[PDB]
Amino acid sequence: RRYRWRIQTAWDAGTVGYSLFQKFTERVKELTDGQLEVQPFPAGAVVGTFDMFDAVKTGVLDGMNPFTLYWAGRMPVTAFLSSYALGLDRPDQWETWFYSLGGLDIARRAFAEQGLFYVGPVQHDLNIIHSKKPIRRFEDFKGVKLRVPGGMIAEVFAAAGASTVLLPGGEVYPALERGVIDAADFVGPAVNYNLGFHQVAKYIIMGPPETPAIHQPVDLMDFTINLNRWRSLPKPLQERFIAAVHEYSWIHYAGIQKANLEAWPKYRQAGVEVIRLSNEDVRKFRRLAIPIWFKWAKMDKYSREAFASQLEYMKGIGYVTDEELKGLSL
């Protein structure tokens, strides 16, 4: 039999991300000899981006390709299924945690409880911030109306004095154009350029060379399927889909990075100034971030289990010291 799944992505039509997503649907068809076809839908075509979770749960959408931390408000563990401020910051570290340190199994158990099947993470990129005004040091975040993807990312910036707001990436351009917000994080350079942020914001704010991305160094996406639909798919096809997603994870990653290399010269051409924060600004964010990591970990049994193993890993590779964990518990 042939199966057809309808999957909407967080990528807006007309972005490098959507183009990569379109090709993935062709690859799935090739890998399953046409037995499984995925019909792609750009952000907002079936439902709003943040409404994808419920639509996939009901089966109205067969699956979704979101940025995983979008569900942080309803599933605490998802704040730990994508990068959070100053924690693990390399694609290979997240890949290791998910694929050998138990991360994938935590995600699958948590999503199964929601009637969803978490297939696996899709590698992507770090994120940058676009601002209408110069933010040159930690203290300049005070009073900035900043769009961020909620969750722990928003909490960290709020602890730095920013007024945070949650908006889908597609609403950032009009918000900055009208001055409804002063700044916005979204994704990396290439897609932000596709969305025109450079024309409504003259600055790009990044961390120092040592920590380019303070908040989201590894902004993971994923594929999540309605559990019933997943369980109805023949096992051989389920296994091929898992392989297709893991292969795509890196094909997506590479395509985004190539587009990013091409985008930087364009920002310079557009007259956009890239502001680099300092190592000291990062330390100020670090002191705010660690206690917040623990508060989020303490939300439910899944966030605790995921952070516990991530913390152990961070200790093993020198990303956290016992001294800085003083007074914190788990």
Which residues contribute to the site for Zn ion (CB under 5 A)? Answer: 127, 185, 216
16: helix, strand or coil:
helix
Which entry of Zn ion, a second copy, none binds 209, CB below 5 to 8 A by partner kind? Answer: a second copy
Q: Which is nearer to a second copy, 49 or 310 (CB)?
A: 310
Neighbours of 14 (CB within 10 A): 13
Residue 71 contact among a second copy, Zn ion, none, beta carbon within 5 to 8 Å by kind: none
Taking the least distance from each CB to a second copy, the nearer of 318 and 327 is 318
Q: Tell whether 260 is in a known binding site.
A: no
- The C-alpha angle 258, 196, 52, rounded to 5 degrees, equals 80
Binds 45, which of a second copy, Zn ion, none (CB < 5 to 8 A, cut-off by type)? Answer: none
- Smallest distance from the beta carbon of 91 to a second copy, in angstroms? 4
- Which residue has tokens 């798919």? 233
* Residue at shortest CB range from Zn ion: 127
Q: Is 147 annotated as a binding residue?
A: yes
Q: Which two tokens stand for residue 219?
A: 């902004």
In angstroms, rounded to a whole number, what is the distance separating the alpha carbons of residues 143 and 269? Answer: 30
Task: Compute the least distance from the CB of residue 293 to Zn ion, in Å.
Answer: 18
The separation between CA 315 and the C-alpha centre of its own chain, rounded to angstroms, equals 23
Q: Give the one entry of Zn ion, a second copy, none that residue 185 binds, where binding means its C-beta sits below a cut-off of 5 to 8 angstroms depending on kind.
A: Zn ion
Output DSSP code: residue 205: E
Q: Map tokens 């749960």 to a residue.
A: 57
Q: Compute the distance between CA of residue 25 and CA of residue 142 in angstroms, rounded to an integer.
A: 43
194 among annotated binding-site residues = no
Q: Is 1 annotated as a binding residue?
A: no
What whole-number distance in Å separates Cα of residue 90 and Cα of residue 14?
27
Report what 175 binds from Zn ion, a second copy, none; CB cut-off 5-8 Å by kind: none
Nearer to a second copy, 186 or 313 (CB): 313
Close Cβ partners of 258 (under 8 Å, ≥ 6 residues apart): none
Q: Does 219 carry a binding-site annotation?
A: yes
| Least gap, CB of 317 to a second copy (angstroms) | 8
**Per-position DSSP letters for 68-92, written without gaps between them:** GGGGTTT-GGGGGSS--TTS--SHH
d(CA 19, CA 234): 28
**Separation between Cα atoms, residue 224 and residue 146, nearest integer Å:** 29
Q: Is 222 annotated as a binding residue?
A: no
Minimum CB distance to a second copy, residue 310 (Å): 13
127 assigned ligand-binding residue: yes
Nearer Cβ to Zn ion (83/224): 83
Question: Which spans of this chain sit near a second copy (rule: CB under 8 A)?
Answer: 30-31, 33, 90-92, 95-96, 98-101, 123, 209, 236, 239-240, 242-244, 246-247, 249-251, 253-255, 257-258, 261, 264, 313, 316-318
Quote the DSSP letter at residue 271: T
Instruction: Show binding-site residues.
Output: 70, 127, 147, 185-186, 216-219
Instruction: Show binding-site residues for substrate.
Output: 70, 127, 147, 186, 216-219
